[PDB]
């Protein structure tokens, strides 16, 4: 299981928080226009994430593994407000109207990112599917903390219900990463090489997505 | 309207008119036939959450996904879930957990599950739901009959032994209603595939029940 350490090293060496977009974020050096383009363009992935999870679940005969995947899917989509609801709240807190959001056309970078996730989640390796999701979710707790700080320090976010997306979990997200790590081991079928390849593609794809909001 | 034709396909090839359940409702099944049925059904019971997630994973209608997730949660979330409750019914028939695990699904069982998965992973969301509806819309009536047969002929006096049929079928009425709404929500001028799915599902179920005679 040293491939799990290789997996974490890939992610550490290509981590979203070292991307220029989030370095600028941490300094307040982002325009309203930039934050608005980012929140709108991210919606596609936010809406797709439940499908990444059900994609893997639908191909899985490990009953305990399915329960862990279902747990995450419920966290994402069950109830009101769900994750998609909370993301919309953050979009509207930035000045985008409900109709600007629904009218937005996802960029090519956003579509390529979502396609990278779905390719792994519908592929022939369950472990590599989970590894694709882990390569994203394992970054989220740290990102959420930094994003919350920038939002209150530089971008004028006083009403804490306005960044509830980054808050109402930031804990569930720690749990998701831990359970995904265990899922990778439960579902491994001599395909550690695919686990690592999924991580490389996902981390690069996330960088390409963040690249699109800089000049 | 294709929904009425759909309901007529199901009414006219209904599991409760199959010889197996005809014999069930008279007590004319042996303890050995029951145990074979209960063990062979386990493949389908375990697979059912995957039918729902397969459709969900191909769906961008956010409201439709929530209804599919509701059914999936009903099936698999919590303890005891549906699968645990089926095991309870199996073991109440005299089968050991070792025998249940060791059981190899028949070809008729595998064929029935492959029919469901063929539609749920296919290119028509509405026809995937219609395949599930062609089964689930039958279950409230079937659950009622089976409960009668179990208590009246096969010695079930502890209601916990047939909890699979009770603690949910009441939710299965809701599932059929919601799946009928889902078929409409997701229709993409593929009513013909909706009907094709129902023909295959109703017949696959007859083939499955055929195998116990």
Short mmCIF file of C-alpha atoms in Angstrom, two decimals:
data_model
loop_
_atom_site.label_atom_id
_atom_site.label_comp_id
_atom_site.label_asym_id
_atom_site.label_seq_id
_atom_site.Cartn_x
_atom_site.Cartn_y
_atom_site.Cartn_z
CA UNK A 1 0.00 0.00 0.00
CA UNK A 2 2.88 2.41 -0.64
CA UNK A 3 0.94 3.41 -3.77
CA UNK A 4 -1.33 5.28 -1.33
CA UNK A 5 1.70 7.33 -0.33
CA UNK A 6 2.55 7.85 -4.00
CA UNK A 7 -1.07 8.97 -4.53
CA UNK A 8 -0.83 11.59 -1.78
CA UNK A 9 2.52 12.79 -3.16
CA UNK A 10 1.01 13.35 -6.62
CA UNK A 11 -1.71 15.47 -5.04
CA UNK A 12 0.70 17.40 -2.80
CA UNK A 13 2.94 18.14 -5.81
CA UNK A 14 0.00 19.46 -7.91
CA UNK A 15 -2.28 21.02 -5.26
CA UNK A 16 -4.93 23.60 -6.18
CA UNK A 17 -3.88 25.91 -3.34
CA UNK A 18 -0.49 26.43 -5.00
CA UNK A 19 -2.25 27.49 -8.21
CA UNK A 20 -1.90 31.18 -9.07
CA UNK A 21 -5.70 31.61 -8.90
CA UNK A 22 -5.76 30.63 -5.20
CA UNK A 23 -2.50 32.45 -4.39
CA UNK A 24 -4.17 35.62 -5.69
CA UNK A 25 -7.30 34.64 -3.74
CA UNK A 26 -5.27 34.44 -0.53
CA UNK A 27 -4.06 38.01 -1.17
CA UNK A 28 -7.36 39.55 -2.25
CA UNK A 29 -5.90 40.03 -5.75
CA UNK A 30 -8.99 38.87 -7.62
CA UNK A 31 -11.60 41.03 -9.29
CA UNK A 32 -15.33 40.74 -8.78
CA UNK A 33 -15.46 39.66 -12.42
CA UNK A 34 -13.04 36.81 -11.74
CA UNK A 35 -14.89 35.47 -8.69
CA UNK A 36 -18.12 35.65 -10.66
CA UNK A 37 -16.78 33.80 -13.70
CA UNK A 38 -15.32 31.14 -11.37
CA UNK A 39 -18.51 30.58 -9.37
CA UNK A 40 -20.60 30.31 -12.54
CA UNK A 41 -18.20 28.01 -14.40
CA UNK A 42 -17.91 25.67 -11.37
CA UNK A 43 -21.66 24.98 -11.36
CA UNK A 44 -21.33 22.30 -14.04
CA UNK A 45 -19.02 20.21 -11.82
CA UNK A 46 -21.12 20.88 -8.71
CA UNK A 47 -24.19 19.49 -10.47
CA UNK A 48 -22.27 16.52 -11.91
CA UNK A 49 -20.64 15.35 -8.66
CA UNK A 50 -23.62 13.20 -7.53
CA UNK A 51 -23.33 11.39 -10.88
CA UNK A 52 -19.62 10.62 -10.32
CA UNK A 53 -20.60 8.80 -7.12
CA UNK A 54 -23.63 6.96 -8.50
CA UNK A 55 -21.56 6.01 -11.55
CA UNK A 56 -19.14 4.08 -9.33
CA UNK A 57 -21.86 2.73 -7.07
CA UNK A 58 -23.81 1.38 -10.05
CA UNK A 59 -20.83 -0.78 -11.03
CA UNK A 60 -20.02 -2.11 -7.55
CA UNK A 61 -20.92 -5.46 -5.98
CA UNK A 62 -19.14 -4.75 -2.68
CA UNK A 63 -22.12 -4.04 -0.42
CA UNK A 64 -20.14 -2.30 2.32
CA UNK A 65 -18.34 -0.21 -0.33
CA UNK A 66 -21.71 0.78 -1.81
CA UNK A 67 -22.90 2.00 1.60
CA UNK A 68 -19.90 4.31 1.89
CA UNK A 69 -20.49 5.67 -1.63
CA UNK A 70 -24.18 6.15 -0.81
CA UNK A 71 -23.23 8.04 2.38
CA UNK A 72 -21.27 10.57 0.33
CA UNK A 73 -24.03 10.81 -2.29
CA UNK A 74 -26.62 11.54 0.43
CA UNK A 75 -24.30 14.19 1.90
CA UNK A 76 -24.14 15.74 -1.56
CA UNK A 77 -27.74 15.57 -2.76
CA UNK A 78 -30.24 14.58 -0.04
CA UNK A 79 -32.28 17.16 1.86
CA UNK A 80 -32.63 20.93 1.51
CA UNK A 81 -30.44 22.86 1.18
CA UNK A 82 -28.16 20.25 -0.44
CA UNK A 83 -24.66 20.95 -1.80
CA UNK A 84 -26.03 22.17 -5.11
CA UNK A 85 -28.42 24.48 -3.27
CA UNK A 86 -25.59 25.82 -1.11
CA UNK A 87 -23.39 26.48 -4.16
CA UNK A 88 -26.17 28.54 -5.76
CA UNK A 89 -26.36 30.59 -2.54
CA UNK A 90 -22.65 31.40 -2.88
CA UNK A 91 -23.17 32.34 -6.54
CA UNK A 92 -26.04 34.67 -5.68
CA UNK A 93 -24.00 36.16 -2.81
CA UNK A 94 -21.51 37.34 -5.47
CA UNK A 95 -24.09 39.35 -7.44
CA UNK A 96 -24.97 36.77 -10.10
CA UNK A 97 -28.64 36.47 -10.67
CA UNK A 98 -30.46 33.12 -10.77
CA UNK A 99 -30.98 33.67 -14.50
CA UNK A 100 -27.37 34.63 -15.27
CA UNK A 101 -26.36 31.37 -13.57
CA UNK A 102 -28.84 29.19 -15.46
CA UNK A 103 -27.92 30.93 -18.73
CA UNK A 104 -24.15 30.53 -18.29
CA UNK A 105 -22.42 28.33 -20.88
CA UNK A 106 -19.71 26.18 -19.23
CA UNK A 107 -16.25 26.87 -20.62
CA UNK A 108 -14.28 24.24 -22.52
CA UNK A 109 -11.96 23.93 -19.50
CA UNK A 110 -14.90 23.19 -17.18
CA UNK A 111 -16.27 20.57 -19.59
CA UNK A 112 -12.86 18.89 -19.96
CA UNK A 113 -12.55 18.71 -16.16
CA UNK A 114 -15.99 17.13 -15.72
CA UNK A 115 -15.22 14.71 -18.57
CA UNK A 116 -11.99 13.66 -16.84
CA UNK A 117 -13.91 12.80 -13.67
CA UNK A 118 -16.65 10.91 -15.52
CA UNK A 119 -14.14 8.97 -17.64
CA UNK A 120 -12.58 7.51 -14.47
CA UNK A 121 -15.88 7.02 -12.63
CA UNK A 122 -17.42 5.06 -15.55
CA UNK A 123 -14.14 3.28 -16.46
CA UNK A 124 -13.12 -0.31 -15.90
CA UNK A 125 -11.45 0.26 -12.49
CA UNK A 126 -13.56 1.02 -9.41
CA UNK A 127 -10.43 1.85 -7.38
CA UNK A 128 -9.27 4.32 -10.04
CA UNK A 129 -12.72 5.89 -10.06
CA UNK A 130 -12.54 6.47 -6.32
CA UNK A 131 -8.95 7.71 -6.70
CA UNK A 132 -10.14 10.35 -9.16
CA UNK A 133 -12.66 11.62 -6.60
CA UNK A 134 -10.12 11.36 -3.76
CA UNK A 135 -7.63 13.45 -5.73
CA UNK A 136 -10.21 16.28 -5.54
CA UNK A 137 -11.98 15.80 -2.21
CA UNK A 138 -8.78 15.26 -0.21
CA UNK A 139 -7.86 18.87 -1.14
CA UNK A 140 -11.20 20.41 -0.17
CA UNK A 141 -10.87 20.83 3.64
CA UNK A 142 -7.74 22.97 3.28
CA UNK A 143 -9.15 24.88 0.29
CA UNK A 144 -12.42 25.64 2.08
CA UNK A 145 -10.52 27.11 5.04
CA UNK A 146 -8.43 29.40 2.83
CA UNK A 147 -11.40 30.39 0.67
CA UNK A 148 -13.45 31.31 3.75
CA UNK A 149 -10.61 33.50 5.01
CA UNK A 150 -10.22 35.39 1.73
CA UNK A 151 -13.98 35.89 1.47
CA UNK A 152 -14.27 37.61 4.84
CA UNK A 153 -10.89 39.40 4.79
CA UNK A 154 -10.91 40.84 1.25
CA UNK A 155 -14.17 40.22 -0.63
CA UNK A 156 -16.68 41.62 1.87
CA UNK A 157 -18.43 38.49 3.17
CA UNK A 158 -19.90 39.26 6.59
CA UNK A 159 -23.14 37.23 6.48
CA UNK A 160 -21.78 33.76 7.30
CA UNK A 161 -24.80 32.04 5.74
CA UNK A 162 -23.45 33.34 2.42
CA UNK A 163 -20.53 30.87 2.41
CA UNK A 164 -22.48 28.01 4.04
CA UNK A 165 -21.26 25.71 1.22
CA UNK A 166 -17.70 25.96 2.57
CA UNK A 167 -18.86 25.75 6.21
CA UNK A 168 -21.82 23.37 6.76
CA UNK A 169 -19.46 20.50 5.98
CA UNK A 170 -15.68 21.22 6.17
CA UNK A 171 -15.89 18.14 8.36
CA UNK A 172 -18.03 15.87 6.24
CA UNK A 173 -15.31 16.64 3.69
CA UNK A 174 -12.58 15.34 5.99
CA UNK A 175 -14.68 12.20 6.49
CA UNK A 176 -15.20 11.76 2.72
CA UNK A 177 -11.44 11.80 2.06
CA UNK A 178 -10.81 9.22 4.77
CA UNK A 179 -13.57 6.91 3.51
CA UNK A 180 -12.38 7.27 -0.08
CA UNK A 181 -8.88 6.21 0.96
CA UNK A 182 -10.38 3.09 2.52
CA UNK A 183 -12.56 2.50 -0.56
CA UNK A 184 -9.49 2.52 -2.81
CA UNK A 185 -7.99 -0.32 -0.76
CA UNK A 186 -11.27 -2.30 -0.53
CA UNK A 187 -11.81 -2.10 -4.29
CA UNK A 188 -8.20 -2.48 -5.48
CA UNK A 189 -7.81 -5.27 -8.05
CA UNK A 190 -4.11 -5.07 -8.95
CA UNK A 191 -4.75 -1.70 -10.59
CA UNK A 192 -2.62 0.62 -8.44
CA UNK A 193 -1.17 1.92 -11.71
CA UNK A 194 -4.62 3.18 -12.73
CA UNK A 195 -5.15 4.77 -9.29
CA UNK A 196 -2.00 6.83 -9.84
CA UNK A 197 -2.84 7.66 -13.47
CA UNK A 198 -6.31 8.89 -12.47
CA UNK A 199 -4.73 11.17 -9.84
CA UNK A 200 -2.33 12.66 -12.39
CA UNK A 201 -5.11 13.38 -14.86
CA UNK A 202 -7.45 14.82 -12.23
CA UNK A 203 -4.86 17.12 -10.63
CA UNK A 204 -3.71 18.40 -14.06
CA UNK A 205 -7.34 18.90 -15.16
CA UNK A 206 -8.10 20.94 -12.05
CA UNK A 207 -5.10 23.17 -12.84
CA UNK A 208 -6.30 23.63 -16.42
CA UNK A 209 -9.67 24.68 -15.03
CA UNK A 210 -8.12 27.23 -12.69
CA UNK A 211 -5.86 28.50 -15.50
CA UNK A 212 -8.93 29.77 -17.38
CA UNK A 213 -9.60 32.62 -14.91
CA UNK A 214 -6.21 34.35 -15.38
CA UNK A 215 -5.02 36.51 -18.28
CA UNK B 1 -51.64 7.35 -24.00
CA UNK B 2 -48.55 5.18 -23.68
CA UNK B 3 -48.83 5.13 -19.87
CA UNK B 4 -52.12 3.28 -20.16
CA UNK B 5 -50.67 0.84 -22.69
CA UNK B 6 -47.77 0.36 -20.26
CA UNK B 7 -50.13 -0.49 -17.40
CA UNK B 8 -52.01 -2.91 -19.67
CA UNK B 9 -48.83 -4.80 -20.58
CA UNK B 10 -48.18 -5.30 -16.87
CA UNK B 11 -51.77 -6.25 -16.05
CA UNK B 12 -51.76 -8.80 -18.87
CA UNK B 13 -48.44 -10.44 -17.83
CA UNK B 14 -48.63 -10.11 -14.06
CA UNK B 15 -46.53 -12.25 -11.72
CA UNK B 16 -49.57 -13.07 -9.56
CA UNK B 17 -51.14 -14.93 -12.53
CA UNK B 18 -48.04 -17.08 -12.99
CA UNK B 19 -48.43 -20.72 -12.00
CA UNK B 20 -45.84 -20.27 -9.22
CA UNK B 21 -47.94 -17.70 -7.37
CA UNK B 22 -51.16 -19.48 -8.31
CA UNK B 23 -49.72 -22.44 -6.38
CA UNK B 24 -48.48 -20.04 -3.68
CA UNK B 25 -51.97 -18.75 -2.97
CA UNK B 26 -53.25 -22.33 -2.41
CA UNK B 27 -50.28 -23.44 -0.29
CA UNK B 28 -49.30 -25.81 -3.13
CA UNK B 29 -45.57 -25.06 -2.90
CA UNK B 30 -43.13 -27.20 -0.98
CA UNK B 31 -40.73 -25.87 1.62
CA UNK B 32 -38.06 -26.89 -0.89
CA UNK B 33 -39.51 -24.70 -3.66
CA UNK B 34 -39.69 -21.74 -1.27
CA UNK B 35 -36.04 -22.03 -0.26
CA UNK B 36 -34.93 -22.28 -3.90
CA UNK B 37 -36.96 -19.17 -4.79
CA UNK B 38 -35.69 -17.23 -1.76
CA UNK B 39 -32.04 -18.06 -2.49
CA UNK B 40 -32.28 -17.44 -6.23
CA UNK B 41 -33.94 -14.03 -5.64
CA UNK B 42 -30.92 -12.77 -3.66
CA UNK B 43 -28.99 -11.76 -6.80
CA UNK B 44 -31.80 -9.40 -7.84
CA UNK B 45 -32.21 -8.07 -4.29
CA UNK B 46 -28.52 -7.18 -4.10
CA UNK B 47 -28.53 -5.73 -7.61
CA UNK B 48 -31.58 -3.48 -7.18
CA UNK B 49 -29.67 -0.48 -5.70
CA UNK B 50 -27.45 -0.60 -8.81
CA UNK B 51 -30.45 -0.34 -11.15
CA UNK B 52 -31.35 2.97 -9.50
CA UNK B 53 -27.84 4.40 -9.35
CA UNK B 54 -27.24 3.40 -12.98
CA UNK B 55 -30.13 5.67 -14.08
CA UNK B 56 -29.22 8.43 -11.62
CA UNK B 57 -25.63 8.51 -12.91
CA UNK B 58 -26.85 9.27 -16.46
CA UNK B 59 -29.39 11.96 -15.48
CA UNK B 60 -29.08 15.75 -15.50
CA UNK B 61 -32.69 16.42 -14.41
CA UNK B 62 -31.97 17.45 -10.81
CA UNK B 63 -35.55 16.88 -9.64
CA UNK B 64 -35.61 13.43 -11.28
CA UNK B 65 -32.33 12.52 -9.56
CA UNK B 66 -33.81 13.36 -6.14
CA UNK B 67 -36.72 10.93 -6.67
CA UNK B 68 -34.28 8.22 -7.79
CA UNK B 69 -32.12 8.89 -4.74
CA UNK B 70 -35.19 8.65 -2.46
CA UNK B 71 -35.85 5.13 -3.75
CA UNK B 72 -32.16 4.20 -3.49
CA UNK B 73 -32.07 5.38 0.13
CA UNK B 74 -35.23 3.38 0.87
CA UNK B 75 -33.48 0.32 -0.56
CA UNK B 76 -29.97 0.54 0.87
CA UNK B 77 -29.62 3.21 3.56
CA UNK B 78 -29.78 2.36 7.24
CA UNK B 79 -30.02 -0.95 9.10
CA UNK B 80 -31.88 -3.14 8.48
CA UNK B 81 -32.03 -2.20 4.78
CA UNK B 82 -33.90 -4.16 2.12
CA UNK B 83 -31.04 -6.60 1.63
CA UNK B 84 -30.81 -7.34 5.36
CA UNK B 85 -34.58 -7.87 5.42
CA UNK B 86 -34.43 -10.34 2.53
CA UNK B 87 -31.76 -12.32 4.38
CA UNK B 88 -34.10 -12.36 7.39
CA UNK B 89 -36.78 -13.93 5.20
CA UNK B 90 -34.34 -16.43 3.70
CA UNK B 91 -33.09 -17.58 7.11
CA UNK B 92 -36.71 -17.83 8.30
CA UNK B 93 -37.19 -20.43 5.55
CA UNK B 94 -34.53 -22.69 7.07
CA UNK B 95 -31.61 -21.59 4.92
CA UNK B 96 -28.30 -20.95 6.72
CA UNK B 97 -26.22 -17.83 5.94
CA UNK B 98 -23.62 -20.26 4.61
CA UNK B 99 -26.08 -21.79 2.14
CA UNK B 100 -27.34 -18.38 1.03
CA UNK B 101 -23.84 -17.04 0.42
CA UNK B 102 -22.77 -20.26 -1.32
CA UNK B 103 -25.83 -20.35 -3.60
CA UNK B 104 -25.01 -19.93 -7.29
CA UNK B 105 -27.70 -17.90 -9.12
CA UNK B 106 -29.54 -19.83 -11.83
CA UNK B 107 -29.45 -18.83 -15.49
CA UNK B 108 -33.05 -17.62 -15.28
CA UNK B 109 -32.03 -15.41 -12.33
CA UNK B 110 -28.98 -14.01 -14.10
CA UNK B 111 -31.12 -13.40 -17.20
CA UNK B 112 -33.72 -11.48 -15.18
CA UNK B 113 -31.07 -9.23 -13.60
CA UNK B 114 -29.30 -8.68 -16.92
CA UNK B 115 -32.63 -7.57 -18.42
CA UNK B 116 -33.03 -4.92 -15.73
CA UNK B 117 -29.45 -3.73 -16.07
CA UNK B 118 -29.69 -3.65 -19.89
CA UNK B 119 -32.49 -1.08 -19.65
CA UNK B 120 -31.10 0.93 -16.70
CA UNK B 121 -27.70 1.34 -18.41
CA UNK B 122 -29.26 1.91 -21.86
CA UNK B 123 -29.64 5.07 -23.91
CA UNK B 124 -33.21 5.91 -22.77
CA UNK B 125 -33.68 7.22 -19.23
CA UNK B 126 -37.45 6.84 -19.52
CA UNK B 127 -37.14 3.20 -20.61
CA UNK B 128 -34.82 2.46 -17.69
CA UNK B 129 -37.44 3.77 -15.26
CA UNK B 130 -40.19 1.89 -17.15
CA UNK B 131 -38.25 -1.35 -16.64
CA UNK B 132 -38.22 -0.73 -12.87
CA UNK B 133 -41.87 0.34 -12.87
CA UNK B 134 -42.91 -2.87 -14.67
CA UNK B 135 -41.60 -4.76 -11.60
CA UNK B 136 -42.22 -2.38 -8.72
CA UNK B 137 -45.82 -1.53 -9.69
CA UNK B 138 -46.63 -5.23 -9.12
CA UNK B 139 -45.04 -5.49 -5.66
CA UNK B 140 -47.79 -4.04 -3.39
CA UNK B 141 -50.26 -6.69 -4.55
CA UNK B 142 -47.58 -9.40 -4.52
CA UNK B 143 -46.41 -8.51 -1.01
CA UNK B 144 -50.01 -8.74 0.21
CA UNK B 145 -50.49 -12.18 -1.34
CA UNK B 146 -47.13 -13.54 -0.12
CA UNK B 147 -47.81 -12.40 3.45
CA UNK B 148 -51.11 -14.29 3.32
CA UNK B 149 -49.46 -17.42 1.94
CA UNK B 150 -46.65 -17.33 4.49
CA UNK B 151 -48.87 -17.01 7.57
CA UNK B 152 -51.60 -19.37 6.29
CA UNK B 153 -49.60 -22.25 4.78
CA UNK B 154 -45.90 -21.97 5.60
CA UNK B 155 -45.95 -21.45 9.36
CA UNK B 156 -44.93 -17.80 9.66
CA UNK B 157 -46.34 -16.54 12.95
CA UNK B 158 -43.59 -14.07 13.85
CA UNK B 159 -44.24 -10.92 11.76
CA UNK B 160 -40.51 -10.15 11.95
CA UNK B 161 -39.98 -13.14 9.62
CA UNK B 162 -41.79 -11.39 6.74
CA UNK B 163 -40.78 -7.81 7.58
CA UNK B 164 -39.34 -7.40 4.06
CA UNK B 165 -42.89 -7.58 2.73
CA UNK B 166 -44.49 -5.37 5.44
CA UNK B 167 -42.18 -2.57 6.62
CA UNK B 168 -41.84 -1.29 3.03
CA UNK B 169 -44.69 -2.35 0.75
CA UNK B 170 -46.50 0.88 1.48
CA UNK B 171 -43.34 2.57 0.32
CA UNK B 172 -43.57 0.45 -2.82
CA UNK B 173 -46.88 2.14 -3.59
CA UNK B 174 -45.00 5.45 -3.42
CA UNK B 175 -42.15 4.10 -5.57
CA UNK B 176 -44.51 3.05 -8.38
CA UNK B 177 -46.28 6.43 -8.27
CA UNK B 178 -42.96 8.29 -8.39
CA UNK B 179 -41.63 6.12 -11.20
CA UNK B 180 -44.71 6.89 -13.29
CA UNK B 181 -43.98 10.59 -12.79
CA UNK B 182 -40.30 9.98 -13.66
CA UNK B 183 -41.27 8.32 -16.96
CA UNK B 184 -43.11 11.50 -17.97
CA UNK B 185 -40.36 13.84 -16.71
CA UNK B 186 -37.71 12.00 -18.71
CA UNK B 187 -39.59 11.09 -21.90
CA UNK B 188 -37.59 11.98 -25.03
CA UNK B 189 -39.98 10.78 -27.77
CA UNK B 190 -39.10 7.22 -26.75
CA UNK B 191 -42.50 5.87 -25.72
CA UNK B 192 -41.81 2.85 -27.92
CA UNK B 193 -38.77 1.97 -25.81
CA UNK B 194 -40.82 2.39 -22.64
CA UNK B 195 -43.20 -0.28 -23.94
CA UNK B 196 -40.39 -2.51 -25.24
CA UNK B 197 -38.79 -2.44 -21.77
CA UNK B 198 -42.05 -3.52 -20.13
CA UNK B 199 -42.47 -6.45 -22.52
CA UNK B 200 -38.95 -7.73 -21.75
CA UNK B 201 -39.23 -7.22 -17.98
CA UNK B 202 -42.63 -8.87 -17.60
CA UNK B 203 -41.45 -11.88 -19.63
CA UNK B 204 -38.09 -12.14 -17.81
CA UNK B 205 -39.98 -12.35 -14.54
CA UNK B 206 -42.15 -15.18 -15.94
CA UNK B 207 -39.00 -16.97 -17.09
CA UNK B 208 -37.54 -16.59 -13.60
CA UNK B 209 -40.67 -18.03 -11.96
CA UNK B 210 -40.84 -20.74 -14.67
CA UNK B 211 -37.60 -22.18 -13.28
CA UNK B 212 -39.10 -23.30 -9.98
CA UNK B 213 -41.60 -25.69 -11.59
#
